[PDB]
């Protein structure tokens, strides 16, 4: 029913990163430096296996500061969380979608059962609703 | 007295990231998006302990493409590597300094036994020659 807060996600595998800057269509609300993390189960899916129930992907979003031709990580703005449960999250393609303001377990953001999240991630049906690609 | 190639570093703990853009005093050679990784042993030092022998820090440098106000990871340019051995690397303050072109074990970049690396990292003697700070 609810997505679990992914405790210890900072110790997980770093999948990839990207920076979204002002002018980007998604500056509101995912402007900043983001890092994608995967637990062991999510790595199975990312490698081209299937995602086991209990796979978790985290979108970790930082604000950044301009420091002399460097973008420096500032405060955490939020995390997004995808948790795999084929049965419990069947209404949103087997992934539960949640946001935590500032990465705080007490600041749950999603109000529509993740239908908005799923609406965009649906475009990625062929890669099991995951945008991020495992890179070397 | 050569630094070992840190095989499996991509599975290690992600410490932090930073973007170095053109015009930065160090754009040559570390312009791009970099990610710092730490093995279990390096984490002990980042948390406020003594860096044990066998601690490894990796500076993982990607080129990026600026595309519609996103900075998107491209190809790996290089890795930098600090390997802790108080005895073997005593001439450079107990860290061995190496680079690998494109992160490939056969493309060693350091030609002065790491004296140039050490010359800058010496400013951080008080944090055992490490710039990166562990963040949550
Ligand atoms: C399109 C308009 C999107 C909406 C709405 C949401 N997400 Fe999404 N998400 C999107 C992109 C383009 C990416 C890839 C970023 C990259 O660096 O390549 C993501 C990624 C995630 C991830 C990581 C897993 C993955 O699919 O790559 C998570 C955990 C995630 N997003 C969660 C999430 C939630 C909880 C949303 C609703 C609150 C949500 N997303 C909206 C595109 C879009
Ligand atoms: C100053 C003029 C530097 C020189 C020359 C070298 N490095 Fe360094 N390095 C520098 C900074 C400011 C940072 C921090 C980056 C950040 O995101 O905060 C780094 C970092 C590293 C790391 C990561 C560990 C750390 O100390 O934070 C490694 C593994 C590293 N550098 C290796 C390295 C090597 C191999 C060098 C000579 C080839 C070298 N660096 C030189 C500053 C400077
Ligand atoms: Zn300038």
Residue numbers in the entry:
A (entry chain A), B (entry chain B): 3 to 138
What does the paper say about this structure?
Cytochromes c′ (cyts c′) are a group of putative NO-binding heme proteins that fall into two families: the well-characterized four alpha helix bundle fold (cyts c′-α) and an unrelated family with a large beta-sheet fold (cyts c′-β) resembling that of cytochromes P460. Of these, cytochrome P460 (cytP460) is a heme enzyme that oxidizes hydroxylamine to N2O as part of nitrification (1), whereas the evolutionarily related cytochrome c′-β (cyt c′-β) binds the diatomic gases, NO and CO (2). By contrast, our recent crystal structure of cyt c′-β from Methylococcus capsulatus (Bath) (McCP-β) reveals a hydrophobic distal pocket dominated by two Phe residues (F32 and F61), a structural feature we have named the “Phe cap. Proposed roles for cyt c′-β proteins include protection against NO stress generated during nitrification.
We further probed the roles of the distal Phe cap residues (Phe 61 and Phe 32) by comparing the properties of wt McCP-β with those of the F32V and F61V variants, focusing on NO and CO complexes. Our goal in characterizing these aromatic → aliphatic variants was twofold: (i) to provide further evidence that the Phe 32 aromatic quadrupole limits Fe(II)→XO(π∗) backbonding and (ii) to establish the extent to which the Phe 32 aromatic quadrupole influences heme–gas reactivity. We assessed the impact of the Phe 32 aromatic quadrupole on McCP-β heme–gas affinity by comparing the structural, spectroscopic, and kinetic properties of wt McCP-β with those of the F61V and F32V variants.
